[PDB]
Design a protein around this ligand. Sequence first.
Ligand code: MQ9
Ligand code: 9YF
Ligand code: HEC
Ligand code: HEC
Ligand code: 9XX
Ligand code: PLM
Ligand code: CU
Ligand code: CU
Lengths: 50, 312, 50, 158, 223, 139
Amino acid sequence: FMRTELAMPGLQFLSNEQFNQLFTMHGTVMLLFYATPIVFGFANLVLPLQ
Amino acid sequence: WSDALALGWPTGITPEAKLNRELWIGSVIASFAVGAIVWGLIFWTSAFHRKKATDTELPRQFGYNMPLELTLTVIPFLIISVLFYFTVVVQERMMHKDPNPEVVIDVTAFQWNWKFGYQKIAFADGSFDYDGADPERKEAMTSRPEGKDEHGIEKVGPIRGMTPEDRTYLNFDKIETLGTSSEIPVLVLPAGKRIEFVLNSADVIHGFWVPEFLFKRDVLPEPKANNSDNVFQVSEIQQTGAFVGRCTEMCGTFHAMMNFEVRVVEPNDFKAYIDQRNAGKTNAEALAAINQPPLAITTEPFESRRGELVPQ
Amino acid sequence: IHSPGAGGDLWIMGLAVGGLGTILGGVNMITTVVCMRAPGMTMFRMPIFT
Amino acid sequence: CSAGQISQTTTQEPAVNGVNAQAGQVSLRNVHLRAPQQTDYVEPGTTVELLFVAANDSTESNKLKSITSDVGEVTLTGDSTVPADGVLIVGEPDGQIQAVENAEAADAVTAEVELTKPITNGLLYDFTFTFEDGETTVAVPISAGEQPRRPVPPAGPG
Amino acid sequence: QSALLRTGKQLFETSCVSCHGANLQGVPDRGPSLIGTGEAAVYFQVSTGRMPAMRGEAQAPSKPPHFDESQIDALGAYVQANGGGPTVPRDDHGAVAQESLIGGDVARGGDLFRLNCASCHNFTGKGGALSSGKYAPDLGDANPAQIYTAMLTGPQNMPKFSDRQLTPDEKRDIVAYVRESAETPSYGGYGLGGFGPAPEGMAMWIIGMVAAIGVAMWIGSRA
Amino acid sequence: MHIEARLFEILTAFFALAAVVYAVLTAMFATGGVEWAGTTALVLTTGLTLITGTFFRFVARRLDTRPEDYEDAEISDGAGELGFFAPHSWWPILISLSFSTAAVGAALWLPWLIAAGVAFVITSVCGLVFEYYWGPEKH
Ligand SMILES: CC(C)=CCC/C(C)=C/CC/C(C)=C/CC/C(C)=C/CC/C(C)=C\CC/C(C)=C/CC/C(C)=C/CC/C(C)=C/CC/C(C)=C/CC1=C(C)C(=O)c2ccccc2C1=O
Ligand SMILES: CCCCCCCCCCCCCCCC(=O)O[C@H](COC(=O)CCCCCCC[C@@H](C)CCCCCCCCC)COP(=O)(O)O[C@H]1[C@H](O)[C@H](O)[C@H](O)[C@@H](O)[C@@H]1O
Ligand code: HEC
Ligand code: HEC
Ligand SMILES: *C[C@@H](COC(=O)CCCCCCCCCCCCCCC)OC(=O)CCCCCCCC[C@@H](C)CCCCCCCC
Ligand SMILES: *C(=O)CCCCCCCCCCCCCCC
Ligand SMILES: [Cu+2]
Ligand SMILES: [Cu+2]
């Protein structure tokens, strides 16, 4: 959604605050809800095995 | 070749910007050399395929090369130490803090636009008997004799005896080039002079960044109380003309709509502009009078409409 | 004062809840390595990932 | 996505009686009529005031305010060419603060209309505000700015 | 006042010109024009802290005030001078009147509140939900001056109750009822919010039914 | 547990050095003297590592070399009764749900929901802790 909006100079389909929420939650989700929880996902996966 | 190798760094317009660009070119050259050698190593060890001629015999199975490890952990330290020395010498000219600025601009950045005060002007050649106002810096000391209770509390104030709604840290000036949502502010500066910027934020943190200054600073609400050196100087601005400037820290929803301009004009043009602003006139009127486009030519105050598909 | 909405608050508490799970997960992996190990796996022979 | 491009808060008119007419370079704000009426209509031949604020949008100015007259013969006493990246406050809307309390160009461009036609509160009456840039019909209302209730007679049950 | 107007303009310039130009004309599609809104509207909004709004959404939420009493007065005076409109009530000294706004009659205030206010807020001043993302805030936090100015001006989706529609006496009575309902202790135990059926059913199903089921598990056997 | 303790001892040494140098170079050469945020954080992460390493060192000195910590140890040496490891349990999800209720109560400032979530957290933690100690029903 950020990419589609940023492809053109105008605000085609997003609003200023809707875009602002996107990188907050994208940055949040990807880091804290995908990247940090999956180190313990891999740890739980193989660390006892290893 | 330099422009392409700069990776889209604008050619600076100040001595500090030029020096920073040179440091960036050097550091990018070093980084590309390191990347080239490492990518060569990777694409050359990719030539160590499992050759079908490899019989039932596993590789050398060595690992554990102490001298090679020592060499490749010594050289990176040398590289980064050279880069650090260059960084420090360049940093030294990040804020020389010359106690004799040629023009001082009070840059106060509120929610979603800018305002420029022209706190003081003192040309080295001798001119501009001008100064900032500061009658309007009125405090908000909540030092009432008594509060809700009957006696005893005599509350002074939450923070250092004052209230968060203080705004005393802000400074105000006679000539204010306030930027409206439909009128991009154009701070006009004399060419060839030393320009100091005293940076402040009315409401929230955001960031003053003139991309062609090759330098940004974060206008914070109360930099003095936050141990932030908001005020920063620029030794000179060689090239004239209009240079875009942008907001480079989170301001709120309209963080992308805080663009401004820093129009560098000749010292005589600045004389005329400041005289005509002392006379009752707006920034656009003064620009037109000094025969320079009134509206920001590098950017527009684009639509206040929430977007394209909104029904007007 | 700025960003007064509920979404901002839910974000703050959502990280606090998720943060605790990350902290507790760190206690398991660090305690697992320190305590639970094979009879011959010394600390300098456990794999690099562990 | 209640904070998208079509947002309630952003798409709001001011909670004021006067209408808004952005047509033309100069934008009209809180344009209403002060026409205190004691009965069904404000009878023709009685002068009532036309309050509004003309705010200039472009600083490059449209300070003329040529005629701004319609059915009612609106006359602009103390007319002046104020709007230049600024405001022109024709009259004194109820509650207006006397920011000066002195005769600055006498009245501040007060617009008054001799009706020549009955008007009453609750109706909309077209007024053509014409600056040198252009002309715009505004459909001004009647506003009882700060006047309290007029005592309705007590009712005798029947 | 001259200096008050100057201070109000100063604060306006560095607070809200991004949403209503220096002329107070509304910025198209960011904020409405402040011409005619009035000192009362400015006081209500800024004192409640609602207005220095940092997002465009269904409803601008309330939040801690961004200006003290003197600065709020400066903003209100500046906006009144620019546009001219309703003025916040004030007492003999000059400060915003709050105790004076407590109407003597409270049954009349309650009847008026139920006819007009409870429509969307609640029986006893709690909040209520509105069409799409909007809501009526709970009145417990509003002081008498804020309640009176909230009636006097329609902030957003609240009908604007002019003085002719609700004369200052009726508005004072409504303020008195609001304060009484907010500060009145709940007779007959903890008042579960103010909403009866939903909080009460939840409290039943949790407290009473967990107690009953746990006591049944204690008395009886598992098999 | 010699290496286990030494890891934290090394970390403590590094963090103590970092805290000291930060405090000195911030008390002098900073805009407003000691930063008091980075300084305190560095001091108390030094404390984190110091506590953990001190406990590990106490344990290492109190313990004879384990098969785990002993090079050249056969599997039979460590073979024996491993301790209790909790089998299947559905109390963790209830604890997480109760803490989520308390968290949403804190976010949406709902004191009633905060109280309910805290009560549920107490109940769920009690269930988890008592899971393997609750005796048979006595009828
Ligand atoms: C319900 C059932 C067993 C049906 C059998 C299948 C059948 C013959 C269906 C034909 C009828 C049809 C068409 C049914 C579909 C919909 C339906 C049930 C309509 C009729 C509704 C009716 C008259 C009776 C249903 C009553 C019923 C069995 C409710 C669930 C009761 C149970 C097992 C509760 C769990 C026990 C327990 C510890 C409860 C307390 C814990 C909490 C908080 C549970 C969640 C919770 C509940 C359960 C509330 O009721 C509630 C009410 C108001 C506010 C909040 C809550 C709330 O949070
Ligand atoms: C066996 C029965 C056991 C029952 C327990 C009884 C609890 C006793 C509570 C304390 C004594 C009685 C208080 C009576 C006086 C009183 O009413 O208490 C209010 C407080 O109220 C709150 O805030 C809540 C505070 C949180 C603690 C209480 C929460 C208990 C809940 C959890 C019990 C029900 C179970 C529900 C489970 C939910 C989970 C579902 C899964 C306090 O004033 P205040 O805080 O200012 O209320 C505002 C006005 O002012 C203002 O105008 C008004 O406008 C409002 O803003 C108002 O809040
Ligand atoms: C929907 C119709 C509506 C009715 C009629 C109405 N209100 Fe409201 N009220 C609202 C809405 C919507 C808001 C939100 C305004 C805002 O946030 O700017 C509000 C806000 C308020 C506030 C602000 C509270 C705070 O803490 O910010 C008060 C006080 C208030 N109303 C009291 C009253 C009183 C007194 C009446 C007397 C009849 C009344 N209301 C009638 C809907 C209504
Ligand atoms: C875009 C962000 C925004 C900023 C920042 C902002 N406003 Fe507003 N203003 C709005 C919006 C949107 C409304 C109508 C919806 C609402 O009030 O929630 C409004 C309405 C108002 C109203 C009520 C109008 C009426 O008719 O009831 C007043 C008074 C007001 N603003 C004054 C101010 C003052 C004073 C400030 C500076 C302290 C300010 N505003 C800052 C956007 C803003
Ligand atoms: C503004 C428009 C544009 O955005 C979109 O259209 C994206 C919508 C994505 C689809 C969302 C569906 C709702 C979630 C369903 C989850 C399963 C529920 C069944 C089980 C109980 O759209 C909008 O109007 C709003 C867009 C924002 C939507 C946010 C959704 C946030 C999800 C959150 C409530 C958590 C979901 C729980 C998932 C549980 C499954 C794992 C256990
Ligand atoms: C409404 O007011 C908020 C609009 C938010 C705009 C951005 C859209 C985010 C959607 C991401 C996916 C949500 C979670 C998906 C769960 C299945
Ligand atoms: Cu910015
Ligand atoms: Cu900003």
